[PDB]
């Protein structure tokens, strides 16, 4: 399952005639595109590898 | 008279060009400006679709 | 019979209704339907509603159908079953609506609700406008508006033109006719009238009030200039002050400067301005210049 | 009936309303809609509101529709249900609006709020302007403005033209008619009047004040010159001083220098200037030169 | 009535006001709008203010 979430503030005069506004005209734009399932877990680092990436000398 | 258009494989029909046939073509009165009119010697202009 | 001509009753008002329709029966003077896709789209919609499904991919070139906009007035206290007149106006590239018929058209209000249904035969003058027509009793009322008439003991007469003197005159006339505290004035435009509680009693009160006679007091001096139609209208209160006027190709009937005498009534003003020998288009500029200078003791309004 | 013609009441003012609309029913004299995309865009908007969705990719070439701007005046003390006149003006490449009809148009104020709704049939003169028209009672008032009239014991009469003498005259007339301290003067343009607390009492006071007669004292000498229309207007206070004038192709009726006598009243000034034999366009330059020199004892205003 | 014609009162003066606008209702005698971009720009501004986005 994939989730696309959007939030922001829109000026009414930036909305086009077809009730559309580009995402670059939204003030506090919060855009999120995430997923779950084993596909999403396959894109997470292992805990040991994350620990090393954060605490290894090099 | 058929007219072809865009996005329409089939030509549309616009109408029929009917010809007038007289029984004494010598008898029409020449108005002048490339026009002939029926007279008493060439009365009864018969409309017909061309070919018949 | 003057109060009914000077005021309107609060809550007794007219609304505006609009709708879309199709006009059929034209003699090849309808829409081309190649530059107006909505005509064919709505004809297909009507046919589908009636049970005929024309395939989506098909060329429809009509000549006897025109897409039209229908306008109507919702009357005060309208009741379902009553008929009203409608105006039918072509919308795109149609040539004439001389013998057309308006099909079933729902007339929506501002709130996008159906208040009437329009269907009938158009009457077109036929120099005359060909793309506009009128249908008398062309629409039947289908919805009714709630109102507060008959509730409370106060009703407001709203003057067509704001005037403290006219408001006071109407108030004094009502008080002279129907008791001491029958009417009061709220501003230059509104007169509040006390009426008995109920529906029939208020109808009786308004029937007595409406036909009352009120002597109209003199209004403000005003000169109305219409440059688009080339007209000038001066009311009876316009006066003039003495001053000199000069304009191109105008001279004393002599010198280019012509004196204009001080005028008190309208006849004197008309005589003084006709002594100038000015065309109305020239009279417009003359009047504007005199208003700027101060000779014209009137309000110059360009409409 | 002069005070109502010389002053205006504070708070009794007019506002301006504007809006956008479509005019249909034209005889092929509407917008081309190829150079005016907003006409077709707003027609599609109206159709979508009415329930018809024309596909986005489609060529619409109309001939009976024109995009127009509607202007109106919001009257003092306007009440909902009242009707006002509107002016309809074409906006782009339209040819005529002779028999058009204005569809539902919301008239916005400066604050971008709807104060009236406009819909009706246009009247066009038909040398006459074709792209502009007027609809009498074409708009119905929908919103009402709050006001402070009837609150407090002070109301200001604002003179149309600033004058200390006229302000004092109006104050003295009100004091002579309605008691000692009824009116006071604040500046050259404003006269403060004390009125009883309430609505009806103030309406009565204003009704008595408005029709009062005030003798107008003499104003400042002023010569108004309109070069765009070619007109000159001189009020009754203009005087002349003796001096010599020369201009091209003008001579004594003889030498090119012509004497102008000292003139006290307007008739003498007109006679002296007509003795010059000057065209009004020449009279403009003559008057400007005399004002520069000092013969013209008046304020020369070019409008 | 001569002092009012020879002098002016201190503080009693006139100011000048300026502004930009659009004039509509002309009979084909308006701007060409190809050599005057501001006409179309301000018309679009007015339409956007009124609720129409070209």
UniProtKB/Swiss-Prot annotation, chain A:
Subcellular location: Cell outer membrane; Bacterial flagellum basal body
Family, as annotated: Belongs to the FlgH family.
Main function: Assembles around the rod to form the L-ring and probably protects the motor/basal body from shearing forces during rotation.
Assembly mode: The basal body constitutes a major portion of the flagellar organelle and consists of four rings (L,P,S, and M) mounted on a central rod.
Name by which UniProt lists this protein: Flagellar L-ring protein
Organism this protein belongs to: Salmonella typhimurium (strain LT2 / SGSC1412 / ATCC 700720)
From Swiss-Prot, chain B:
Transmembrane segments: none
Subcellular location: Bacterial flagellum basal body
Superkingdom field: Bacteria
Signal peptide positions on this chain: none
Family per record: Belongs to the flagella basal body rod proteins family.
Oligomeric form and interacting partners: The basal body constitutes a major portion of the flagellar organelle and consists of four rings (L,P,S, and M) mounted on a central rod. The rod consists of about 26 subunits of FlgG in the distal portion, and FlgB, FlgC and FlgF are thought to build up the proximal portion of the rod with about 6 subunits each.
The name this protein goes by in its record: Flagellar basal-body rod protein FlgG
Biological source species: Salmonella typhimurium (strain LT2 / SGSC1412 / ATCC 700720)
Species classification: Bacteria, Pseudomonadati, Pseudomonadota, Gammaproteobacteria, Enterobacterales
Name of encoding gene: flgG
Residues of the full protein shown: 157 to 208 of 260
From Swiss-Prot, chains C, D:
Keyword field contains Metal-binding: no
Top-level taxon of origin: Bacteria
Gene Ontology MF terms in the entry: structural molecule activity
InterPro entries per the UniProt record, alphabetical: Flag_FlgI (IPR001782)
Cellular component, GO annotation: bacterial-type flagellum basal body, distal rod, P ring; outer membrane-bounded periplasmic space
GO biological process: bacterial-type flagellum-dependent cell motility
Subcellular localization, as worded in the UniProt entry: Periplasm; Bacterial flagellum basal body
UniProt keyword annotations, A-Z: Bacterial flagellum, Periplasm, Signal
The protein's role, per its UniProt record: Assembles around the rod to form the L-ring and probably protects the motor/basal body from shearing forces during rotation.
Family: Belongs to the FlgI family.
PANTHER family noted in UniProt: FLAGELLAR P-RING PERIPLASMIC PROTEIN FLGI (PTHR30381), FLAGELLAR P-RING PROTEIN (PTHR30381:SF0)
Subunit record text: The basal body constitutes a major portion of the flagellar organelle and consists of four rings (L,P,S, and M) mounted on a central rod.
Protein name: Flagellar P-ring protein
Originating species: Salmonella typhimurium (strain LT2 / SGSC1412 / ATCC 700720)
Species lineage: Bacteria, Pseudomonadati, Pseudomonadota, Gammaproteobacteria, Enterobacterales
Gene symbol of the encoding locus: flgI
């Amino acid at each position: 399952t994939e989730f696309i979430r959007f939030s922001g503030v829109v000026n009414p005069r930036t909305i086009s005639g077809s009730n559309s506004v580009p995402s670059t005209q939204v003030a506090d734009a919060r855009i999120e595109y995430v997923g779950n399932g084993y596909i999403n877990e396959a894109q997470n680092m292992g805990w040991l590898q994350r620990f090393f990436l954060n605490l290894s000398p090099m | 008279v058929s007219v072809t258009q865009q996005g329409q494989a089939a030509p549309v029909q616009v109408g029929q060009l009917n010809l007038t046939t007289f029984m004494n073509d010598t008898g029409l009165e020449s108005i002048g400006e490339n026009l002939y009119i029926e007279t008493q010697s060439s009365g009864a202009p018969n409309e017909s679709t061309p070919g018949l | 019979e003057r109060i009914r001509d000077l005021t309107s009753v609060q809550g007794v008002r007219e609304n505006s209704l609009i709708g879309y329709g199709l006009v059929v029966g034209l003699d090849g003077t309808g829409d081309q339907t190649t530059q107006t896709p909505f005509t064919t789209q709505t004809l297909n919609n009507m046919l589908s509603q009636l049970g005929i499904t024309v395939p989506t991919g098909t060329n429809m070139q009509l000549k006897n159908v025109a897409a039209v906009m229908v306008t109507a007035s919702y009357p005060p206290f309208a009741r379902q079953g009553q008929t009203i007149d409608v105006v039918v106006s072509s919308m795109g590239n149609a040539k004439s609506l001389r013998g057309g018929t308006l099909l079933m058209t729902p007339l929506k209000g501002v709130d996008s609700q159906v208040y009437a249904l329009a269907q009938g035969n158009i009457l077109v003058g036929g120099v005359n406008q060909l793309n506009g027509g009128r249908i008398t009793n062309g629409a039947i009322i289908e919805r009714e508006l709630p109102t507060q008439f008959g509730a409370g003991n106060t009703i407001n007469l709203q003057l067509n033109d704001e005037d403290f003197t006219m408001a006071q005159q109407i108030t004094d006339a009502i008080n002279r006719a129907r008791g001491y505290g029958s009417a009061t004035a709220l501003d230059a435009r509104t007169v509040q009238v006390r009426v008995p509680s109920g529906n029939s009693s208020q109808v009786r009160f308004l029937a007595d009030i409406q036909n009352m006679e009120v002597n109209v007091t003199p209004q403000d001096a005003k000169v109305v200039i219409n440059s688009r139609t080339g007209s000038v209208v001066m009311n009876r209160e316009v006066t003039l002050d003495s001053c000199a006027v000069a304009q191109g190709n105008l001279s004393v009937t002599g010198g280019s400067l012509q004196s204009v005498r001080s005028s008190a009534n309208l006849n004197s003003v008309v005589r003084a301005l006709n002594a100038l020998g000015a065309t109305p288009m020239d009279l417009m500029s003359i009047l504007q210049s005199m208003q700027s200078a101060g000779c014209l003791r009137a309000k110059l309004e360009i409409i």
